[PDB]
Amino acid sequence: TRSAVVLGGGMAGMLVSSMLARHVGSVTVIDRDAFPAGPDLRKGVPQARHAHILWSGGARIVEELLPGTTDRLLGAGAHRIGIPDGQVSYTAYGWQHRFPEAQFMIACSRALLDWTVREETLREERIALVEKTEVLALLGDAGRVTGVRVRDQESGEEREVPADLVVDTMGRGSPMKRLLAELGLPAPEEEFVDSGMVYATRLFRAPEAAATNFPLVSVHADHRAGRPGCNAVLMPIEDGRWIVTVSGTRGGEPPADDEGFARFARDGVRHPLVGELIAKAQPLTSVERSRSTVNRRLHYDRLATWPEGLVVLGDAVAAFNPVYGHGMSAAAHSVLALRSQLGQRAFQPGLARAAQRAIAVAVDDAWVLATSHDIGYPGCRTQTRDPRLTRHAGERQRVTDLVGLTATRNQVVNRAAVALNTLSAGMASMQDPAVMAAVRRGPEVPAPTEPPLRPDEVARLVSGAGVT
Ligand SMILES: Cc1cc2nc3c(=O)[nH]c(=O)nc-3n(C[C@H](O)[C@H](O)[C@H](O)COP(=O)(O)OP(=O)(O)OC[C@H]3O[C@@H](n4cnc5c(N)ncnc54)[C@H](O)[C@@H]3O)c2cc1C
């Protein structure tokens, strides 16, 4: 028997549905949007206009739950950029020397990634996708949730969809607070770190030579400096295009005009690299800024009471800054925290209280890595009580500076760094006796004085057809 219901159809909803469908009978995915039968931009996912990094940890977790996604993505035009052999990033501590492949990423427009995860998840006959359907209230009481009360927007007919487990994958704009309040509970301990970052993405047609096999280029800010931090990223996607993304916090926001965007990429960031790489490229669209870039975590886990059958994961319990790129891996890791809680307790009481506390730990790494750098920015309003950001947050800032400073010129420290920053290990793995010893060993390669671009990569920026 057993029956689940997943609210939302995003990266979180599809993933958790592909894991639940192997643990229950029927999975009913509810959403209020129009899902397209073709990698097109959607209104429920407006982030799809800006590029989305899928780190290794989230990549091989999507692959585990959706076999055949990586190769299908890699066949539609997505690249498997290695790390740090396929990235030319100006870190806060210098240029990242391009060591051999330690971890990897998946670079593609979010519209494709959401599709390749959707059409692969919907291959199971038990998952029933229900589009254009608003959610009104949760069915049950304050001790057990039994389903949802939805209503179609095209017909207006109300109904009662019940299930043994209600999953909330309703993005950053999760009305969970409203749905829970009507159920009869208090408000969760809201915690947020608001740096005020302002995204600014604009597509770029890569040169004909650099359509395939081009490295993830980025110029990062110095979180130890007193200036408003501002980054700039140039990752390649499908169909031979380039996503150029600039960012900035409260005080150094990027402009809206197209003519000013090409300036911020080379006259606002700490190095004018990307601004030179976009002068080799054909602009397509305009600047489509997004301001919903504020780490916000709602600790449902520490509530005094929690109903049975209700689980919240994705961007509904913990959403983070997009300049670091952990949103998808935190959701993927959260799904595995529910799975690693469904095999122990089955469908017994305590599932919700144990799956929420497990989801709490799953995103804890994606919550420190995000906020630990944002707290040091100017005029950032933060409402947080965890001591790792208040007191003795200097030691947490004094060590991370050292690890990141050595990782630029030390393989062992780098291979252990991107195994954590790309959510592929734990924060305890950075206390390895062979990592603390490699930090004390010091740099092993000189700091590059120029962008560590390979000649066979820079030569891929011009067509060269105007010569005999
Ligand atoms: C600008 C930007 C850039 C980002 N960049 C990155 C990045 O580089 N790397 C990374 O890892 N993460 C990134 N993220 C985060 C990433 O988008 C999210 O972490 C991820 O989408 C989480 O999936 P989700 O299903 O929880 O939310 P979503 O993917 O947003 O899914 C929400 C779903 O719920 C539905 N829904 C919403 N409201 C309702 C409602 N009232 N009723 C019914 N259904 C509803 C929507 O239609 C949608 O299907 C970025 C986010 C933004 C905004």
Author numbering: 20 to 487
Q: What did the published study say regarding this structure?
A:
Lasalocid A, a polyether ionophore natural product derived from Streptomyces lasalocidi, is a widely used veterinary medicine that acts by transporting various cations across the cell membrane, thereby disrupting cation homeostasis. We performed protein engineering on Lsd18 to improve its thermostability and catalytic activity. Screening of these mutants using thermal shift assay identified stabilized variants Lsd18-T189M, Lsd18-S195M, and the double mutant Lsd18-T189M-S195M.
We found that the Tm values of Lsd18-T189M, Lsd18-S195M, and Lsd18-T189M-S195M were increased by 3.0 °C, 4.5 °C, and 4.8 °C, respectively. As expected, the FAD content in the mutants Lsd18-T189M, Lsd18-S195M, Lsd18-T189M-S195M increased by 29.3%, 46.7%, and 38.3%, respectively, compared to the wild-type Lsd18. The structural stability of the double-mutation system is lower than the S195M mutation system but higher than the T189M mutation system. In order to reveal the structural basis for the higher thermostability of the best two mutants, we solved the crystal structures of Lsd18-S195M and Lsd18-T189M-S195M at the resolution of 2.50 Å and 3.76 Å, respectively. Although the resolution of the second structure was not high, the secondary structure was clear enough for analysis. Furthermore, the loop region R314-L316, E208-F210 and C398-Q401 in Lsd18 WT change to a β sheet in the two mutants’ crystal structures, also indicating that this region is less flexible and more stable. T189 formed hydrogen bonds with D187 and G192.
